[PDB]
Write a protein that binds this DNA or RNA. Structure first.
Ligand SMILES: Nc1ccn([C@H]2CC[C@@H](COP(=O)(O)OP(=O)(O)OP(=O)(O)O)O2)c(=O)n1
Ligand SMILES: [Mg+2]
Ligand SMILES: [Mg+2]
Ligand code: NA
Length: 348
DNA sequence: AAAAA
DNA sequence: TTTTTGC
DNA sequence: AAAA
């Protein structure tokens, strides 16, 4: 009776996944295609996984898949196999593949992506111990921090830790911009209990162009002085008012145990901060809330269904030849002709 | 890999 | 068939 | 170039 859209932005996806048996398998197959640089097959498995996550019931027969989009012949074979024996032979083969195991292990290090993981694999490396102890290898500053704080960063971040970080961010930010609005974005805004990092959007209604530019530098220098800044990379803005990203920083912060309301006495935490102009705060909030799949389908829907162009800074209508303004996420959804999807419903 | 053009 | 897939 |  319910006509499920192929777009994540036209579906409500909450964290209660009734099809984790199927989506864990589809996520593994997608990840393998990402590694094999098969972008098309990767995206097809990510879309199939995304739609199953939106279902209000578990798939228990092939009849249950009728009318569900993004499930082509290959994906239906995978679902059929899992219904048969409770296992995916396809995903099991990927989990036993040497290239796949190496890519997962290597990219688990902060600062190591697809290119460096592929380089290390082709050199014959298979373990992190052999990589770290090699005397010929050269590591980026990001990778050095990734190896030094590996156990802390791989253990992830819980809600009490995220809240403790939010307090630190807000305390530091109001010191330099007292009327600044600090919003936790990412997974935690979508209601997640855990995350690999804690993300924040910072905006100020009265700050000048220079004040807006200096905030991330002032806040990180303050933490550097305290000895809390374990890693810092500030990317200056490439945002153009009339046209690429907002001023942002990728950090590793020292989170003292005493600050967490839930050994060494502290934990290394990945933190990302984004500063945007006040008038673009709704576009940035929408972009940074995610999920990744929700954002990509929002942009795809805007292009293919509305002839509009959406990004973290603006919304442009190609037919009316006008930029559309928004003071809230609700106004962006209304401009696109979409029913409002709450942040906890964007877990596509 | 799936859906559209 | 070719093109697109956040771009 | 590469990591986000
Ligand atoms: N390819 C991406 C990656 C991220 N984002 C946006 C939406 C999510 C937000 C945060 O990026 P992440 O921190 O990796 O997202 P996450 O949702 O918070 O998940 P986690 O932080 O647990 O790794 O940035 C996006 O539009 N496209
Ligand atoms: Mg995050
Ligand atoms: Mg992040
Ligand atoms: Na990494």
């Amino acid at each position: 009776v319910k006509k499920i859209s192929q777009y994540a932005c036209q579906r409500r996806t909450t964290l209660n996944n009734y099809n984790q048996l199927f989506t864990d398998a589809l996520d593994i197959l997608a990840e393998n295609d990402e590694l094999r640089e098969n972008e098309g097959s990767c995206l097809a498995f990510m879309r199939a996984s995304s739609v199953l996550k939106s279902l209000p019931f578990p798939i228990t027969s092939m009849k249950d898949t009728e009318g569900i989009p993004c499930l082509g012949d290959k994906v239906k074979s995978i679902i059929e196999g899992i219904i048969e024996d409770g296992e995916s032979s396809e995903a099991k083969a990927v989990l036993n593949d040497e290239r796949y195991k190496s890519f997962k292990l290597f990219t688990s290090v902060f600062g190591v992506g697809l290119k460096t993981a592929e380089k290390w694999f082709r050199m014959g490396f298979r373990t992190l111990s052999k990589i770290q102890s090699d005397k010929s290898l050269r590591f980026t500053q990001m990778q050095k921090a990734g190896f030094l704080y590996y156990e802390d960063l791989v253990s992830c971040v819980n809600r009490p830790e995220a809240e403790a970080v939010s307090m630190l961010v807000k305390e530091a930010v109001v010191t330099f911009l007292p009327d600044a609005l600090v919003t936790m974005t990412g997974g935690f805004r979508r209601g997640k209990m855990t995350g690999h990092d804690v993300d924040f959007l910072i905006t100020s209604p009265e700050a000048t162009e220079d004040e807006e530019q200096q905030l991330l530098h002032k806040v990180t220098d303050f933490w550097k002085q305290q000895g809390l800044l374990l890693y810092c990379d500030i990317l200056e803005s490439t945002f153009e008012k009339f046209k690429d990203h907002f001023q942002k920083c990728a950090l590793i912060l020292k989170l003292d145990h005493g600050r967490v309301h839930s050994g060494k006495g502290w934990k290394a935490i990945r933190v990302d901060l984004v500063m945007c102009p006040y008038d673009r705060r709704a576009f940035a909030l929408l972009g940074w809330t995610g999920s990744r799949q929700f954002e990509r389908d929002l942009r795809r829907y805007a292009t293919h269904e509305r002839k509009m162009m959406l990004d973290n800074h603006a919304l442009y209508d190609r037919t009316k030849r006008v930029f559309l303004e928004a003071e809230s996420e609700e106004e962006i959804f209304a401009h696109l002709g979409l029913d409002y999807i709450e942040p906890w419903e964007r877990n596509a």
